[PDB]
Scaffold this active site. Structure first.
Site, PDB file in Angstrom:
ATOM      1  N   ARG A  66       0.838  -1.198   0.000  1.00 55.68           N
ATOM      2  CA  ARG A  66       0.000   0.000   0.000  1.00 55.68           C
ATOM      3  C   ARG A  66       0.865   1.237   0.000  1.00 55.68           C
ATOM      4  O   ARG A  66       1.904   1.256   0.669  1.00 55.68           O
ATOM      5  CB  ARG A  66      -0.844   0.057   1.277  1.00 55.68           C
ATOM      6  CG  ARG A  66      -1.939  -0.962   1.378  1.00 55.68           C
ATOM      7  CD  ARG A  66      -3.134  -0.517   0.590  1.00 55.68           C
ATOM      8  NE  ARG A  66      -4.099  -1.590   0.468  1.00 55.68           N
ATOM      9  CZ  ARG A  66      -5.211  -1.511  -0.255  1.00 55.68           C
ATOM     10  NH1 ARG A  66      -5.515  -0.391  -0.912  1.00 55.68           N
ATOM     11  NH2 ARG A  66      -6.022  -2.553  -0.313  1.00 55.68           N
ATOM     12  N   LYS A  83      -6.015 -19.143  -3.656  1.00 58.06           N
ATOM     13  CA  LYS A  83      -6.229 -18.146  -4.687  1.00 58.06           C
ATOM     14  C   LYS A  83      -4.918 -17.827  -5.385  1.00 58.06           C
ATOM     15  O   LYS A  83      -3.980 -17.298  -4.775  1.00 58.06           O
ATOM     16  CB  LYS A  83      -6.795 -16.852  -4.096  1.00 58.06           C
ATOM     17  CG  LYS A  83      -8.105 -17.026  -3.413  1.00 58.06           C
ATOM     18  CD  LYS A  83      -8.564 -15.774  -2.668  1.00 58.06           C
ATOM     19  CE  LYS A  83      -8.906 -14.587  -3.576  1.00 58.06           C
ATOM     20  NZ  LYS A  83      -9.353 -13.444  -2.698  1.00 58.06           N
TER      21      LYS A  83
END
Ligand SMILES: Cn1c2cc([S@@](C)=O)sc2c2cnn(Cc3cccc(N)c3)c(=O)c21
Ligand SMILES: Cn1c2cc([S@@](C)=O)sc2c2cnn(Cc3cccc(N)c3)c(=O)c21
Ligand SMILES: O=P(O)(O)OC[C@H]1O[C@](O)(COP(=O)(O)O)[C@@H](O)[C@@H]1O
Ligand SMILES: O=P(O)(O)OC[C@H]1O[C@](O)(COP(=O)(O)O)[C@@H](O)[C@@H]1O
Ligand SMILES: O=P(O)(O)OC[C@H]1O[C@](O)(COP(=O)(O)O)[C@@H](O)[C@@H]1O
Lengths: 514, 519, 517
Positions: A107, A253
C-alpha cells in the site's frame, strides 16, 4: 433430442460442435456450484432467501473490508435464510459459508486528497517512513520494506489496481527512481502490484490471523486464502486454522506469476483452487489470463481437486438486468473448460440485479453441462487415471461407467466426509451425484465439487445398519422424485460401503427408482 | 519447445494439452484471425484510420442502420486514403477490405424529445404508451414511444414482451389498440433515440430486402465494396434475394449472412449452402433466443462453417467495456480467446471502434488475444478431424492443399505461400487450419481485400508488371512473398516455407507444392 | 474395392467387421518377396517363371555350396532377370542377397551317409563325442558335433536340441571331450542336422574365417545385401561392416535375429544395421516357441518406427514343400506378417528344395496383395506421423505431404524419381496405400528398393535428355506407361509425382498432383 444427447454421440469433437442444438432442452439438475459474494445488495434475510431459491450454493464474505461485527451479522443472516427451508428436509438446500481473506498487501501512504501523474515524468519511491504522510507528484512512500530486494532495474510497478504503470531506473538502498509509463490520478493508500516479482510478504498478515480465528469461531465451511505463492503459504494457513479448524477446506487463490509457476506444489498442498482472474490480470498480461485459467482448470481436473473460476464473469450485470454476449460466453466456457464452481462478486455484492445475476449463472451452467463432450472427457480421465489398489476409486470409476451405459438419472452416494462422492465427481459423469449425508458440514462443503447435489438426512439412526442404509438410499430417491431428476422405474446407480464409518465405499448397485 | 505452446501442441490428450498451456510460452509474430472494425465518429478520420491499420484492422465495417450515403461515402474515401498512404512500398502495404452491413428488417424507436442525443431515465413499474402515429416520431419521452414497425399490432399479443435497446429495457403489453400499445416498464434504464426493438415470439413479416436495403446495396456496388453483411437472414431464399439484387455488377461481392434469430439457426444448413460466409450476430441473437443458449448456436455455426470451409465471423460485445475503459474485463479476454479456439475466421468490433473512447486499444487487444489463442489451438486433433471429415475427392487442388498443410506441420514451416487469382487456392489451404500463416500473393486487389475473411490468410498485392516468360512471372511473385514475410518477421533466411503454384496460367490449376528454404 | 469400406471405419473393431471377401484388391502388391534359390529353382528357365510369379529378391544360403556354385547361381539369376530387358515397360529388377552361415553347430553323418536315418527312443542313452574319428559314424549310440567347445559351456541338466528342435536331449553326465545324454524327444535322426543350446553362452566368432571369405566373395559378385546370421549385438554387425569394407559400403546389411541375446539387445543391433530379419526358425528353438510372435511383433514395430526394412522369414508356407496348396495356418501367417507391417516375406525350402516352387511364390503374392488392402491405414498413418519428429529436412516434409495427398485423392500411385533411393524410402516409411513407383537410372538402387514396403522400382535406361524438364517428363511418362501396362491405374486417374528442383541426389522438394494421360 434432450440434453444435447445427439451431440453426445458424435465420433469427433468437430461433429459434436456441429450437433449442438438450441432446441435440445437440458435436464433439471445443474451441477456447477454457484458462489455469491454477499454485500449491501444481498445481505438481508429476505434477499438471501431469494438468492438461495435462485441457486446460490455458497455465500462468500470478502474480508478485505468490514468489521468482525458486520461479518458475524452477515453470517447470521445467511443461516437464518438457509434454515427457513429446514422444515421440509426433502427440499432443503445446504448453503456453505466461505471466508475470503484480505491477505498481504503493498500500500502507498497519505498524499499531501489526490494528485496527477503525467506520462513520462520522474517519480521516486522511498521506504523512509518520514514520507509516510507526505506522498506527492515527485515522491511516493510504500509500506513494503523489502521491495528493493525483490525488483530489478527495468522492472515494472503497478499502482492502484493497475491504473498506474512505472518503470524502475535506479535501485538504491531504501529507494527506487522510476519513470511513469501509465499516468493518471494518484490517491492515498492505494494497492501496488509487482508483476513477475517474488514477493516475500508473509503467507498470512496480522489481520488474516485474527480473521481465520474468527472463521473457526463462526464455524465457516471453507477459506479462500489470498495471494498464495508457494506450498509453504498453504501450510502456514493450515497451521493457523489448527486442530479446531482442521476440517475447514483451504482453497488457494492464484493471483500472480509465481503462483502460476509454482502451481503444482500449491495444488498438492491445497483442498482446491481459485483462479483469481482480477488480480491475476493486473500481474500478467490480460491476453494471457485465459491460458492460465485453462491450465489451472486442466490440472485441477487431473488431480481431482475443486477449481473455482472467479471475477468479472457477469460484470455488466452490476448495472444491467441482462449480461453482455462476452459474459454469457465466459460463463459457458468456464463450465466447458471443467470449472467446478463459478463465482459472482460485485454482481451480487453491490449490483442492482443480484437475483438476475444468480439466475443467469444457473441457466447458462445448466446449458453448458449438457454440451460437454463426455465421450472424450471420460476416456481421457480414465487413461490419465493411475491404476491403484484403493477400492473406493475402482468403485467410483465403475459407477461412472455404469451411469454412462444406462444413462442413469443419478448416482446416489452415501458419504460421511464427502470423499466417496468427490471420487465419483472427479470422473465427471453426466448424471447428478446425490450425496446423502447426516453431517451438515459435509453437505455444505459438497458444493465445491462439480455434479454433487448434497442432501442432509435428518432421519433418526436405525438400530439395524442395513435398514439405516436403506433409509438413506430411499431418502435420496424421494429427493430425486421431488426435484424431478427422475421418476418411478427409472434406473439409478447407488454406492454404499461394507461397514459403517468413513473409508469403506466398495458397493455399486444398479437399482429401479421405487 | 518453449514457444508457440509447442509443449501443449504435442500432448496425446486434450486434457494434457490444457495442462501444458504456458503463460511464459510466447507466440509467433503472425496473427491469423482477421479483425473487422466498425468505423464511426471515433475512428473515421484518416489519421485514426492509419493507426487502426497499423494496430491490425483488416476489414472496415460500415453500419447502414445509421448515417446518410454522403456520410458513408466520405468514411469510405477516408479508409481508402489511409490504406493507400502505405502503398509506396508494396512489400509493407496491407490491404483493407470494406464491408457494408445492411440495416435489414429492423424496428427502431424515434427521437427523444426531437433530439438524437436526448435521453430519459425510466423506472421499473411505470406505464409507457407505444405509438405508430408518425406525429410522435420525434416526440418520444417518459410516456409516449414511437416505433417504425407499421404492422406492430397485427403481429403482437397482450402479455407479450417487447425489448428496447439491445434487450436492456423490457416492456410488457397490458392492452392492445388501433395503432397503439399500452405497457408497463418491467426493467428500467436510460431510454435513448433510434434504439433497436425486438419481438421474440412474434412473427415479424418485414421484407427480407427493404427498399432502403436496395438503395444501400446499389450504393455498395457503386462504391466498390468487398462484402455485404446481410442482416437477419432467415432462410436460403433471403440469401438468393440479396444475390439477385446485387446482380451482375455485384457478382464478385461476397455475401456474409447474419444469423440473428431462431428461424436462421433452425435453417442454418440451407443458409450456409447459399452464402459465402456467416456472421454469428450475437447481439440480436441473444435477444431473439434466451441469452443462455447463444454459446450453443455460436459453437454449432462455427463448427459447421469450419466443416464447410466457409468463413465465420464472431460478432458483438467482444470488448464492450472498452467503449469507456482502456482495458477490457476478464470475461471479454476469455470471449475473444474462446471465439478463436472455437474456430472463428474473424472477430469483430462495433461500438468499441465506432464510438468508444479507446478504439486503438481495442484493436490492439484483439490482436494480442487472437495471437495468444491461435498458438493454444489443439491442431493435432483439429487437423485429424478436418481430414477425416472431408471427402476423398479427385480434385487436384484439394489434394495439394492438404499435402501443403501436412508438410507445414512436419517442418513447422514459417509460411505457406500460395499464388491465387480468385483466392480460392488460398481458401482451400485455410480450411485445413495450418499453424503457419498463409501468404496469398495475387494481382487482383479485390481478392486481396476479400481474402481477409479466412483464418490464416495474409494477402499481399503484387504490383510488379507481368513478365513475358510465365515461369519468371511465377518466380517473381514467389520472391515478393519471401520479401514480405521477412520484412514482417514471419521468417528469416534459411527458414523453410511451403510454396503452392499451378502448372499453367489461370484459375483452377493449382497442383504443385514445393518445400523451399527462404533466400 | 481394396477394402475401402473397411478403410473408412472409425474403430479398429468396425474395420475388422467390414472386411469383405467380395472386395477385390488392386493389382499392385507392395510386400517384397524373397525366394531362396536351390536345385528346385536354379535354372534360368525356372528363374524366369519365378520372376513372372513375383520373386523380387534371390537369397543364396551360404550354409551350403562352394563359391563356384554360388557364382553360377548368381549368373543364372542375372541372365533370367535380363531376358526381360528387351521390353523396358516389363523389366523387373531382381536383387541378390547373400545369407551367411555364421556360427552354426552341425552334427556328423549317420553311418557314412547324407540321407541315412536312425530312431532315437525317449529315455534311451546317447553319447555326444567331439572325437573326429566319429565324424562320419553317427548312429543311435553316438553322435558327433562340430562345436569343439560344447563341453565348457553346457552343464549337467542342460538341454540340447537337434534337427530344427525336433529332437531334444538332456545331459546326465558331462565329460572331458564328451557328454552323456538321455533322449527326451526321440524320433528320426539324420545327418548334418542343426544343433542349438538355449541358455548356453556359445563361444563361436561373430564372423568366422569362412564368413569373412564369403563376405569378400559378396563384394566381388556385387550383391545387393547380406543377411548376417546369429547377430547377438552391435559389435557383431560392425564386424560384418568392417569385412565388407569401403568397397562394399553400399551393400545393405540385414541382421538376422535368431536368439535371446539378439532380442534383448535389439535396439543397439537395429541402430547398427540397415535392416532386420526375424529369423523364426532358430529363434523358436532358442526361445520358447510360444513367444516367437511376441518377438516378431516387437521387431516389426520397432523397425517400422525406425523406418528400417524388416523381413519375416521361415516356415511361412512350409507344407508347400510337398503339397501344391498351403494349410490354413500358413495362409493366416503370411497375411498376418503383412498386417503386422513386414516389408518383405521370405520362402526357404519352399523354393530351394520343394516340389512346388512357383506355387509357393504365387501364393505369397496372392495373400500379400489381399492383406495390404486389409491394413487399417487410417490409424497407421496417424501413429507414424505422430511418432515422427518435426524436422527441417525438406525431403521429409515433401514425403509426408505426398502420402497425405495420396490418401486424399486415393491416388493410383506415388511416382518418385530417385538416384540413391532415399527419397522413395522416405515415402515408404509412412506406409501409403498407393504403390510407390520409384524411377531410377541406378541399377543397384532399383534392386535394393525391394526391401521397402510399397516400392515398385523401375529402371530407366533411356539416355539423359539435355533439357532437364523433358528428362523428368520422360521418366514420369515411363512410370505412367509401366503402371498402365500392369493395371495399377488407367487414363483419367490421379497420381502424385515427387521430384526435385534440379538434377542430382538430395533435392527432392516438389510434389505434383497429375492426371494419368
Ligand atoms: C474444446 N475441445 C476441443 C478442441 C479441439 S481442436 C479439434 O479444436 S479437440 C477438443 C476437445 C476434446 N474433448 N473435449 C472434452 C474434454 C476433454 C478433456 C478435458 C476437457 N476439459 C474437456 C473438449 O472439450 C475438446
Ligand atoms: C491389430 N491392431 C491394429 C493395427 C493397426 S494399423 C497401425 O495397422 S491399428 C490396430 C489396433 C488397435 N487396437 N487393437 C486392439 C483391438 C481393438 C478392437 C478390436 C480388436 N479385435 C482388437 C488392435 O488389435 C489393433
Ligand atoms: O465418503 P466416506 O466419508 O468415505 O463415507 C462413506 C461411508 O458411508 C457408508 O456407506 C455408511 O456409513 P455410516 O452408516 O457410518 O454413515 C459406509 O459404508 C461408507 O464407508
Ligand atoms: O486460386 P486460383 O484463382 O485458382 O488461382 C491459382 C492459379 O494461379 C497460378 O498459380 C498462376 O496463374 P497466373 O499466372 O494466371 O496468375 C496458376 O497456376 C493457378 O491455377
Ligand atoms: O532420392 P535422391 O537420391 O535424393 O534423388 C532424388 C533426385 O532425383 C531428381 O528428381 C532427378 O534427378 P536426376 O535428373 O539427376 O535423375 C532430383 O531432382 C532429386 O534430387
Amino acid at each position: 433430442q434432450t440434453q444435447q444427447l445427439h451431440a453426445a454421440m458424435a465420433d469427433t469433437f468437430l461433429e459434436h460442435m456441429c450437433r449442438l442444438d438450441i432446441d435440445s432442452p437440458p435436464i433439471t439438475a445443474r451441477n456447477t456450484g454457484i458462489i455469491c459474494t454477499i454485500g449491501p445488495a444481498s445481505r438481508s434475510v429476505e434477499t438471501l432467501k431469494e438468492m438461495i431459491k435462485s441457486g446460490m450454493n455458497v455465500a462468500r464474505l470478502n474480508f478485505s473490508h468490514g468489521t468482525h461485527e458486520y461479518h458475524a451479522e452477515t453470517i447470521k443472516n445467511v443461516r437464518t435464510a438457509t434454515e427457513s427451508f429446514a422444515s421440509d428436509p426433502i427440499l432443503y438446500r445446504p448453503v456453505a459459508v466461505a471466508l475470503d481473506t484480505k491477505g498481504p498487501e503493498i500500500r502507498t501512504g497519505l498524499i499531501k486528497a489526490e494528485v496527477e501523474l503525467k506520462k513520462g515524468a520522474t517519480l521516486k519511491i522511498t521506504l523512509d517512513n518520514a514520507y509516510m504522510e507526505k506522498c506527492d507528484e515527485n515522491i511516493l512512500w510504500l509500506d513494503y520494506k523489502n521491495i528493493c530486494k525483490v525488483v530489478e532495474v527495468g522492472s515494472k510497478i503497478y499502482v492502484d489496481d493497475g491504473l498506474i504503470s512505472l518503470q524502475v531506473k535506479q535501485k538504491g538502498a531504501d529507494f527506487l527512481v522510476t519513470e511513469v509509463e501509465n499516468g493518471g490520478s494518484l490517491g492515498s493508500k492505494k494497492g501496488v502490484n509487482l508483476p513477475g516479482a517474488a514477493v516475500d510478504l508473509p503467507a498470512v498478515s496480522e489481520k488474516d490471523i485474527q480473521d481465520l480465528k474468527f472463521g473457526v469461531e463462526q464455524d465457516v465451511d471453507m477459506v479462500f486464502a489470498s495471494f498464495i505463492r508457494k506450498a509453504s503459504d498453504v501450510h502456514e494457513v493450515r497451521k493457523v486454522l489448527g486442530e479446531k479448524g482442521k476440517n475447514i477446506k483451504i482453497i488457494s487463490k492464484i493471483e500472480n506469476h509465481e503462483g502460476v509457476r509454482r502451481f503444482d506444489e500449491i495444488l498438492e498442498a491445497s483442498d482446491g483452487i481459485m483462479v483469481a482472474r482480477g488480480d491475476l490480470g493486473i500481474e500478467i498480461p490480460a491476453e494471457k489470463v485465459f491460458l492460465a485459467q485453462k491450465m489451472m482448470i486442466g490440472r485441477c481436473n487431473r488431480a481431482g481437486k475443486p477449481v473455482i473460476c472467479a471475477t468479472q464473469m457477469l460484470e455488466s450485470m452490476i448495472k444491467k438486468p441482462r449480461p453482455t454476449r462476452a459474459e454469457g460466453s465466459d460463463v459457458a466456457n468456464a463450465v466447458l473448460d471443467g470449472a467446478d464452481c463459478i463465482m459472482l462478486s460485485g454482481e451480487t455484492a453491490k449490483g442492482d440485479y443480484p437475483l438476475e445475476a444468480v439466475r443467469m449463472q444457473h441457466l447458462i451452467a445448466r446449458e453448458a453441462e449438457a454440451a460437454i463432450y463426455h465421450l472424450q472427457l471420460f476416456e481421457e480421465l480414465r487413461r490419465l487415471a493411475p491404476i491403484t489398489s484403493d477400492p473406493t476409486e475402482a468403485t467410483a470409476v465403475g459407477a461412472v461407467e455404469a451411469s454412462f451405459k444406462c444413462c442413469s438419472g443419478a448416482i446416489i452416494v452415501l458419504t460421511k466426509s464427502g470423499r466417496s462422492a468427490h471420487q465419483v465427481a472427479r470422473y465427471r459423469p453426466r448424471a447428478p451425484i446425490i450425496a446423502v449425508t447426516r453431517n451438515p458440514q459435509t453437505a455444505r462443503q459438497a458444493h465445491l465439487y462439480r455434479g454433487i447435489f448434497p442432501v442432509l438426512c435428518k432421519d433418526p439412526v436405525q438400530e439395524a445398519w442395513a435398514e439405516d442404509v436403506d433409509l438413506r438410499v430411499n431418502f435420496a430417491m424421494n429427493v430425486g422424485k421431488a426435484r424431478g431428476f427422475f421418476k418411478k422405474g427409472d434406473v439409478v446407480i447407488v454406492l454404499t460401503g461394507w461397514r459403517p464409518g468413513s473409508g469403506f465405499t466398495n458397493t455399486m448397485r444398479v437399482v429401479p427408482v421405487p
